[PDB]
Amino acid sequence: RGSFVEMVDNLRGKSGQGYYVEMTVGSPPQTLNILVDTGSSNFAVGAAPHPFLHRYYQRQLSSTYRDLRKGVYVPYTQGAWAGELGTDLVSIPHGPNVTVRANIAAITESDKFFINGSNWEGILGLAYAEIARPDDSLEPFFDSLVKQTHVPNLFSLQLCGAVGGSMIIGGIDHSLYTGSLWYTPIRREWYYEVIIVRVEINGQDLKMDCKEYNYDKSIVDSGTTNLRLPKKVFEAAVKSIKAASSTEKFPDGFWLGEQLVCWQAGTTPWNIFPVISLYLMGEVTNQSFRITILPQQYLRPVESQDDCYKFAISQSSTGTVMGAVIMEGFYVVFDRARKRIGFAVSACHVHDEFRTAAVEGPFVTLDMEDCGYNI
Ligand SMILES: CC(=O)Nc1c(Cl)cc(CNC(=N)NC(=O)Cn2ccc3ccccc32)cc1Cl
Numbered sequence: 505r506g507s508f509v510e511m512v513d514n515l516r517g518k519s520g521q522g523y524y525v526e527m528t529v530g531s532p533p534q535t536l537n538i539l540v541d542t543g544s545s546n547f548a549v550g551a552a553p554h555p556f557l558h559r560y561y562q563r564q565l566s567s568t569y570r571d572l573r574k575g576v577y578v579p580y581t582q583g584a585w586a587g588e589l590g591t592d593l594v595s596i597p598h599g600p601n602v603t604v605r606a607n608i609a610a611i612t613e614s615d616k617f618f619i620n621g622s623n624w625e626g627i628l629g630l631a632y633a634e635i636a637r638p639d640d641s642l643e644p645f646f647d648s649l650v651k652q653t654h655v656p657n658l659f660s661l662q663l664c665g666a667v668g669g670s671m672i673i674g675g676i677d678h679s680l681y682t683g684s685l686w687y688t689p690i691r692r693e694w695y696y697e698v699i700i701v702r703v704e705i706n707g708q709d710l711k712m713d714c715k716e717y718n719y720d721k722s723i724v725d726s727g728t729t730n731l732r733l734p735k736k737v738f739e740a741a742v743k744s745i746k747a748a749s750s751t752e753k754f755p756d757g758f759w760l761g762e763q764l765v766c767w768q769a770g771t772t773p774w775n776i777f778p779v780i781s782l783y784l785m786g787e788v789t790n791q792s793f794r795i796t797i798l799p800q801q802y803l804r805p806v807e808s809q810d811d812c813y814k815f816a817i818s819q820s821s822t823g824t825v826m827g828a829v830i831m832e833g834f835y836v837v838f839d840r841a842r843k844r845i846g847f848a849v850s851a852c853h854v855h856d857e858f859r860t861a862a863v864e865g866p867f868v869t870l871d872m873e874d875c876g877y878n879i
Pocket of ligand 1: 521522539541542543544580581582583584616617618619725726727728822825
């Protein structure tokens with residue numbers, strides 16, 4: 505097909521448990537399944553037995569492993585891991601045709617990091633050095649890839665929900681999207697930080713100050729499932745989504761993600777839930793565009809003749825997180841070279857006969873520079 509055809513369909517995963525790519529480390533080769541995470545910046549792999557790991561990195565068997573003689577610890581809200589730094593040869597067999605020497609954290613102990621049944625054994629942090637542990641001197645994988653090889657400073661992700669998808673490294677594959685790509689600036693190179701300028705539920709403006717949408721940052725994060733929204737925005741969004749779906753009644757805990765609702769197999773009334781639109785800052789002054797997702801993105805199937813769903817928009821205290829709920833509607837281009845993120849309708853996104861995810865523009869939005877949080 506296209507020149508990047510061998511990278512198509514190189515991602516796998518279980519719904520809600522993350523998308524992973526095969527990476528081959530060391531010499532002789534040790535291939536592991538690695539979570540693709542645009543929300544972090546460390547390359548780390550399980551390196552000792554764990555109940556949830558089918559396999560792990562064995563440094564003593566790798567002739568090319570070099571010990572950096574330094575520990576590393578990486579905390580999150582929901583888990584953490586500890587390990588040991590070194591470097592080794594790394595290739596991605598269904599990625600670019602190169603081999604690089606990369607930093608690698610060998611995970612030796614962990615708490616609620618690995619996921620039983622997820623089939624991944626490590627994490628590939630694709631964001632920038634600023635948020636690497638132990639500090640920004642530990643060069644992230646993609647930075648090593650670009651520094652050591654000819655591979656262009658860009659990658660793109662098509663996450664196909666219920667899983668699989670494509671990580672195209674060094675370019676764009678045009679079979680993965682329809683319509684046009686629309687770009688938003690990367691505000692600052694740490695997370696993949698962006699600026700949300702307007703939010704609509706079924707076309708109805710939430711009417712909050714755009715500063716609220718980005719308090720205290722908005723990021724694109726493939727390593728987390730939900731669309732996470734700052735508290736005030738979450739509360740307003742839930743009120744609006746409830747209003748739009750009021751022909752049906754759901755318990756309060758459903759909107760909190762604490763209760764599931766199930767339908768008999770194949771009867772989910774998708775039409776009664778609204779679409780959700782985020783407007784993003786464009787590349788020209790006073791110009792924006794909007795991305796729109798369906799309930800097929802934000803209502804997640806969990807684990808018979810009953811189809812149970814979890815509401816996957818949740819409250820955040822660390823800003824807006826555009827997780828898989830957002831990314832599964834779109835082909836997302838991380839154009840690091842031009843400091844921008846592109847969105848187009850995904851050729852694989854889950855939809856129905858009546859509605860589709862959308863990327864539309866341009867719109868006119870004034871004073872967008874004020875939406876961003878400072879310090
Ligand atoms: C079991 C589990 O969640 N493992 C895990 C995975 Cl799969 C990825 C990561 C890396 N994290 C991200 N890429 N993004 C976030 O953690 C986004 N985030 C930021 C705050 C927060 C709170 C609850 C859930 C997610 C939250 C951390 C962990 Cl501990």
